[PDB]
Design a protein around this ligand. Sequence first.
Ligand SMILES: *[C@](O)(c1nnc(C(C)(C)C)o1)[C@@H]1C[C@H](F)CN1C(=O)CNC(C)(C)CO
Ligand SMILES: *[C@](O)(c1nnc(C(C)(C)C)o1)[C@@H]1C[C@H](F)CN1C(=O)CNC(C)(C)CO
Lengths: 728, 728
Amino acid sequence: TRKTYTLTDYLKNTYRLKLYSLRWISDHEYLYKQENNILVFNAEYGNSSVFLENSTFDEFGHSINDYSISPDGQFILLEYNYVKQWRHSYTASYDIYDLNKRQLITEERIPNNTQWVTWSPVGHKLAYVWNNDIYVKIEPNLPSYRITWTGKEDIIYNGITDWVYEEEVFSAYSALWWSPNGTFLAYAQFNDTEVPLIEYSFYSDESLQYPKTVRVPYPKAGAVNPTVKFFVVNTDSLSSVTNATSIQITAPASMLIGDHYLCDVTWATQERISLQWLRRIQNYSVMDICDYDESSGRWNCLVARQHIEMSTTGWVGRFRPSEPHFTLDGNSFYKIISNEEGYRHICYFQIDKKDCTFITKGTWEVIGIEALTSDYLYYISNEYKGMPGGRNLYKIQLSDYTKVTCLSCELNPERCQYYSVSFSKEAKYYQLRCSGPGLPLYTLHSSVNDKGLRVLEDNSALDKMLQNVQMPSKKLDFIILNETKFWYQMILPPHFDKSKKYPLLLDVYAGPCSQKADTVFRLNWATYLASTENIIVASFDGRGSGYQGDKIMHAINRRLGTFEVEDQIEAARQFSKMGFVDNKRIAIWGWSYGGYVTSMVLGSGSGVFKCGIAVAPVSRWEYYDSVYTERYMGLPTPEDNLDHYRNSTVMSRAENFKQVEYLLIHGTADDNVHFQQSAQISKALVDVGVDFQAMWYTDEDHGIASSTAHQHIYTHMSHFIKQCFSLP
Amino acid sequence: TRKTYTLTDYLKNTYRLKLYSLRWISDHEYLYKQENNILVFNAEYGNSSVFLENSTFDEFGHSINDYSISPDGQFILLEYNYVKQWRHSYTASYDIYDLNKRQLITEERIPNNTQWVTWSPVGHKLAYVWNNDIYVKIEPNLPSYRITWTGKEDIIYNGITDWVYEEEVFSAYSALWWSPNGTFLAYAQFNDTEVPLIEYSFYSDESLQYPKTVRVPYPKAGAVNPTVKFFVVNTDSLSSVTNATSIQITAPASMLIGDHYLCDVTWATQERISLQWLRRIQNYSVMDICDYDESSGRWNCLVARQHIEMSTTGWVGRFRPSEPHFTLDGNSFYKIISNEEGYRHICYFQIDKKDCTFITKGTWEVIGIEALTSDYLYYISNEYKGMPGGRNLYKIQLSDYTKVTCLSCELNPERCQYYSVSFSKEAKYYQLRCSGPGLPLYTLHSSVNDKGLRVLEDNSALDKMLQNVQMPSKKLDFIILNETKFWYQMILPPHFDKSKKYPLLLDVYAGPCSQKADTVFRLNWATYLASTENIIVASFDGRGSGYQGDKIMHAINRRLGTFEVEDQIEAARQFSKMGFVDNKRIAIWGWSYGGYVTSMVLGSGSGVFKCGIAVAPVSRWEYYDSVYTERYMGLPTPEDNLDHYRNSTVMSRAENFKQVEYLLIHGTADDNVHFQQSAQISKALVDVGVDFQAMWYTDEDHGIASSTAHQHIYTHMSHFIKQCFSLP
Ligand SMILES: *[C@](O)(c1nnc(C(C)(C)C)o1)[C@@H]1C[C@H](F)CN1C(=O)CNC(C)(C)CO
Ligand SMILES: *[C@](O)(c1nnc(C(C)(C)C)o1)[C@@H]1C[C@H](F)CN1C(=O)CNC(C)(C)CO
């Protein structure tokens, strides 16, 4: 009777989920765009004003990609001519509009092709990288002090990371951290010189007579890693006549003995900074706290203020040693680390005392520290109801670690179980982002007493619509293995009738510290598979997953492609027997790492899976980047972990692919997971004689995100599924 | 009740077709392998002795790829460590074995990596190329004299051709030529300095961590072509003076005005040589005839011995100007050219007279000249029975051109309609090679009387096995269009019932001067398709095809992607009318040029075809080599033929693929028809949202000939056809 959620309704967005993005400018005011017109809001009463009429640059001349208003607000950065690079980088052109004299500054502007630009944390100082060199501008109109002169495309990187640091280390192109008030501009420096390059044809338009060869400095497992350096410079003291002096802050002694990385930078006080260094063998990292010696002009870091973070069960941190959170005075910070039972809780640190006193504990973890006042530390965790897939805001009274208060748990247990937050300047007010299991709910709150000012968004619209369409249902339950529970979720169809046999598709990622089984609400391909194709889509976080302790997450240390593969199978099998699933119709697909698990599984021999799609998979580990791979796999050497590197390969299981219908997809311009990886699978599948399906995607990346290529890649996949499950 | 000719039978070569490849080493003795051991047959009697016992090179310690015995029968060149490259090029290791002292020359040895070798056509001189440089050896066991010191990788080629000459002109790697008695050594030299480079990647073996990039000098339509220079060195005068000297021969100035190519190099006497020059605009070529001047020491080419050959309807020659065959005294030659009617025939030339005289004429074409003795000239043509898809040896008397005898026609008329021959050194003997339409037959004959000596291979053994298998039949008739008849051929299933409707797969090539319709017996994929899946398989030689006159071949000059396409469709429409063709099941599939027409045909919007397959097709002409693309397309400039270039891509007919089922397949290391070509097709379909089937082939070339891939590509295609025709 009622329509179902169709693939068309997905690739098109017939049903758009409402958000509420606001940016706190003061400790009680945030900006919010509404109808291209940016308004300013008073978090208390909720009144607002037209900060910037949507018509202001009604004849700017260019399409304005994005805007950043200077800390004090006396200016508003203007981004255009945007051109995406990797996951976080891009080059764009800017323009600064003096929000006072209503003038689009013109004397001395930011060069075209600017790699990254940033205001100071206070006032209106700008900082930007162009041609790999850092430039500073005290005034929007005044020329700019070229801080560095080593910039040289693909070799030296000042203030911007390289391929590897941007992806696997700083999840950002940027690499320069202003100081609190904007006196010191710190910045990292990367020298890719002896780093091997990955090279791939790019075919551009249809007119490019000869395909171009994209060549990026990218280190693969065991390769030659990029070098790094940290410098700091006083922005207040820069001669227009002379060249800045950036004072280097060398890495420690245990860190310089071998290949290393700069894993995290954080300012403590207007004169103190803390640096965390990670060893190429990522089970050891050291945080330095450098103070500024007014006299010497240099920066000193008293080893008696040095701290160590290591691991005997695996690597350090979740994906990287967590960042610290200093007190106002800077004599102590709070930092998330794993206790002696393998969980990650919050630890209290005296900058010059060797031991840290955890303020939380239990068989749950801390997702992240979100706010630190003098009486409270607010954080997000999955403590509530013992479900690792739900997150909630809490606050612990710094003066009495037993007076914890969950500010979100009971807000609406039915609709909400997964929270995210935003705190204004001095954590005066805060917005709670409820993203599931029910439709998203955005609400603003105040710290003084945790009173719920008002509701900013409730997707009522969406809601009203979705009641005319048979949406699927979700079940988050679990299974006990070895007395340990591993969670899973199933997207069930409408009218799901347990007296029947529904084919099932296992949705897998199964990477390290991943979590595919949670409480969030989603409008995705599966919503369609479940709703229109009556296909149960599962997902399972088994040995390997995170947010549940090291015993599980580290379970795969050095053994990638083992237990997490075997555990996917297990759940399947177990599912395979629940009466409502048709064990002659069980598929499994994956993207990225999932594609890798999807592949390793289809090549397992389990005869549990009929078919399977692997998108942008990883064939073997020696083909991936160093930082990620080695973190979990170690070094590709006989003296280290070559056998498992060699054992972990998809290729060596090619012949087992004979008992499964398989589909391979990759985007020829993938800079993350090289086409080279699938390209290597298929050749192996051809030499053993297994027939299978394949499809490449010209010039698409690890995202196959271009619109047309997106609608096409799903349209192709569904067809592959329906054919496998024999659906009309 | 007998089994059919199955797909496996095709891939596994179960029904082996025999043959008899021999190499004349004299006027009465030829060499043949006969169970691993070169024998020496005597044509006059057939008796025979072991020339090279198979168990000779047993303790060699390498797998020999081929042997080359020196003209005098005094040595033998063992070739090993074979390493292919392009169509014909390849690199190897060599070793000479002194047949007489039955020993293996160990001093002054041929360099590993020799790109080319060649015995002098008399005695035992050796000239090999190694590192783009020529080297001569008067004695197998003495040092080499270097002939050229300009050799340089990917820049200057001496004695070997670059990519475009190796494929589109000479059809061979070797770019040197020995004089009749091997006193001189002529050789072309190529300079691809400013020739762009095609850059594709080669993933290698699974152990290659980083993908290699193949970069090769390749001139695409319109781009910068490689220039050429010709020289001749006297090999006998190397032992007396110092360094060697090479006398250069420069192309006539009618060529020097612009870009030009060297298309032919034919020695006429001991001191007379002909060269043929074609202009980048291949519709006008010239032939210089050059003598060796003993008093100047240089090569003199009298302009009065200059011959022009041009076409006003198209280009010159089938693919390139045909070659001459001089009479002993090198004062006159015979050469196939296009008469006044437009048919290719043997004209008679007096080196210093500009008008030649045809010695054959009519509405058929002489295929090639096979031998020229003092009394007769021998040629192959498709005259017999006015069947163009035919081939027969003919004899013409030089004293009386009215006295023509067809030496093969009536030998066995039902079994043999496609001949090919191999004359002895002076033409005293010859071997005819029946290639169909019955099973291939090889006989031997005496020239003096044209009486058949004996039978070499009659494939009786294969004929027995086949009695016990459902083989498909072949019909070769024609249809009529605009008064002109266009020949076709169908492969028909066993027990073909013209009262039934059979599904039809159109096999196509359509390239200019292509002949897909003929009387040749073959055991290929179609065999299986007709013998196992009861699918009628046809091919059509329409406008553009050759061997029927320039009025049919030159029909598409400057207009590729039109007539030959519009026609292939009509033929489908002609076939369906016949009444045993399932209009609902008609598919087309090509490869290379064919692949291009297949693709054009499905976007045609002709609603004629259901599904189709295009292996390694050309998508647009500007992505293809200049020598070939420009020969039928002109130059992609607006002053020339740009309009039709842009007006004949597959990419623009993307929206029309919606009405059919596509399947694009391409090797990723296709140096000939780059991957670039399908990657632009897919991207063009994906952009209009057209679903299709793809399948790439890691490191396969334009021949996807890898044993496993060969078996893979055909198995995968088989399935596509099956479902396309839901047989199953
Ligand atoms: C792959 O797993 C990948 N790419 N993006 C993603 C998610 C997390 C699904 C968005 O997964 C790819 C292949 C390896 F498995 C690791 N990897 C990465 O992209 C690594 N990148 C992050 C997101 C883990 C951190 O840079
Ligand atoms: C394509 O036609 C091709 N390559 N090999 C072959 C056959 C003869 C089927 C084995 O077809 C390809 C694309 C263009 F049509 C031209 N071309 C060539 O390889 C070059 N054409 C020749 C064969 C006339 C010269 O090498």
